[PDB]
Structure formats: structure tokens, C-alpha cells
């Protein structure tokens, strides 16, 4: 199907308690494959998936230099943004950036991204046409004028059209047996009385990859959105994911309830129910 590569970056200032902490991670689809943490002993970018460990020494050196370069510019930018926003130097502040690319099944670019947040809110984002910016406020418009004068969008566009797609293709081939083979959910329905006359039906999806899934309860074929407790999809810790959906059902009519499961690894969507 389609695939994505994304790099995430977080810098957090800690005034009076050292220089900002910088953490960056890289993903292919829902698989973490690289990390760098500036608080590590001798900080280097490190592998986190078996299919990237084969990259040579020049690879890890280049990645570490780029990570350190981002940590460096983020430290300066945190100081600059205090001025843009008229903020005191005593508080902790956060800069986040994500960039990367989505490719279709044919390996062509579908979308490129490069966007920033300050203290958890949109700051400046590259638009879908890779040749214009959306600034969230007047402070970000200062950065926009600088980046337009420096032709930053042109540099990012060249990367997103070229290296981003080309290296994603490389990773997808090297990791094909795990990155290109979806694991369908293992499913079951459990039953728990809460009274003599009401019971919880919980529809479980376990062990699936990628994380995208649809889990719904229907009553006579009608979605029970309001009455359903739907937990956030959560990592199992082994690169697969979990989710469940629960409804409280009055005694005697469990049979009107069906749980519907959609996942790209399933040969056919599932219609499940509680039966002893």
C-alpha cells in the first residue's frame, strides 16, 4: 500500500538546570528505526529496527552530525522565540518539528511535510505545494519572511522529492518482510456482568500492524458511538498494537450487538458477537 517516513524532533529548555534537552526519532510507517538523545552518555544516532543495522559507518556519522546540528539550531531558536513572544527566560519552553514524506503504492511522492510547533501549538508549516508557508501568528511571520528570503522551501522541496522518497524505498526493501507484511488483529469478545441485569461486552483486537484499525459496536446494524468506550490504540511493546471497544448491554439482548473490525491485514472485515 502507501508508506511514510517521518522524523520527529523535540527540544525542551530547562533554565537554571542545564542546556536544552534534544530528542529525535525516525519512523517508517509505524516502526521506530532510529533515535538520538542529547542526554545519552556519548550521544550518537542509534538503530532501533533490525533492517537499519546494516547501514555502514558513514551512515551513522552523517545522521549524528545532522542531529547535533538540529540540537544546535534549536538551542538558538529557543532563545530567539523568547524575544518574538516577549517571554521571560525563567520558564521552560518547547520546540517541535516533524518532516517527511508519504509515497503511494507505485513509489511516487504523495505528500511532503515540514512543520513546527512552539509550546505545543502550530508555529510554521510548509504547505502541500512545497513552495509556500502557513504561519500561525505574527511571530511565525517573522520566520516566514526569513525563510522566504533564504529560499528554504526550495531546499526542503528538493529533499522531499528526492532523497526522502528514494531512501524510504531503500528501507522498505531492506525491511520488506516486516514493513510490507501486515499482521491482522487477533480478535475475541469478552463478557462481564456489572449487575444482575447488565453486562459489559468488550471487543478485543490484539497483535496487529500497522496501527490503523476500525473497531465499532453496532446494535441492529446501527453504530453505538455514544455508548461505546473506545480506547486509544496502544503499543504492545513488540511493534504490534492493541485496541478494544466496550458497550454496556442490558440482560437478554447481547444478540442484537455486533462488533465490526476493519484492518488492512484481514482477508475480509469481521463481524463478531458474544455467544457463550
Amino acid at each position: 500500500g502507501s508508506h511514510s517516513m517521518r522524523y520527529f524532533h523535540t527540544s525542551v529548555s530547562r533554565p537554571g538546570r542545564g542546556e536544552p534537552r534534544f530528542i529525535t526519532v525516525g519512523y517508517v510507517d509505524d516502526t521506530l528505526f532510529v533515535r538520538f538523545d542529547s542526554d545519552a552518555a556519548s550521544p550518537r544516532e542509534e538503530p532501533r529496527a533490525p533492517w537499519i543495522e546494516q547501514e555502514g559507518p558513514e551512515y551513522w556519522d552523517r545522521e549524528t552530525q545532522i542531529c547535533k546540528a538540529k540540537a544546535q539550531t534549536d538551542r538558538e531558536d529557543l532563545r530567539t522565540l523568547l524575544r518574538y513572544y516577549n517571554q521571560s527566560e525563567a520558564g521552560s519552553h518547547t520546540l517541535q518539528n516533524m518532516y517527511g514524506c508519504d509515497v503511494g503504492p507505485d513509489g511516487r511522492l504523495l505528500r511532503g511535510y515540514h512543520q513546527d510547533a512552539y509550546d505545543g501549538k502550530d508555529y510554521i508549516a510548509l504547505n502541500e505545494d512545497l513552495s509556500s508557508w502557513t504561519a500561525a501568528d505574527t511571530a511565525a511571520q517573522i520566520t516566514q519572511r526569513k525563510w522566504e528570503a533564504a529560499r528554504v522551501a526550495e531546499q526542503l522541496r528538493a529533499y522531499l522529492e528526492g532523497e526522502c522518497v528514494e531512501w524510504l524505498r531503500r528501507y522498505l526493501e531492506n525491511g520488506k518482510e516486516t514493513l510490507q507484511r501486515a499482521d491482522p488483529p487477533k480478535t475475541h469478545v469478552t463478557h462481564h456482568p456489572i449487575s444482575d441485569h447488565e453486562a459489559t461486552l468488550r471487543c478485543w483486537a490484539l497483535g496487529f500492524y500497522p496501527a490503523e484499525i476500525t473497531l465499532t459496536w453496532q446494535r441492529d446494524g446501527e453504530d453505538q458511538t455514544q455508548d461505546t468506550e473506545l480506547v486509544e490504540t496502544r503499543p504492545a511493546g513488540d511493534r504490534t498494537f492493541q485496541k478494544w471497544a466496550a458497550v454496556v448491554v442490558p440482560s437478554g439482548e447481547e444478540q442484537r450487538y455486533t462488533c465490526h473490525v476493519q484492518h488492512e491485514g484481514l482477508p475480509k472485515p469481521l463481524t463478531l458477537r458474544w455467544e457463550p
Binding site: 522524523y7 525516525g26 551512515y59 552523517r62 545522521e63 545532522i66 542531529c67 546540528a69 538540529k70 539550531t73 538558538e76 531558536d77 530567539t80 522565540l81 518532516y99 513546527d116 508555529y123 510554521i124 520566520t143 526569513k146 525563510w147 533564504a150 528554504v152 531546499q155 526542503l156 529533499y159 532523497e163 526522502c164 531512501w167
Partner: peptide, 10 residues
């Protein structure tokens, strides 16, 4: 692999 010419200066 990462973008090597990330914007300096916000």
C-alpha cells in the same frame, strides 16, 4: 535518511 540542510535560524 535525514535532511542535511535543515533551516538554521527561526
Amino acid at each position: 535518511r535525514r535532511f542535511s540542510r535543515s533551516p538554521i535560524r527561526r
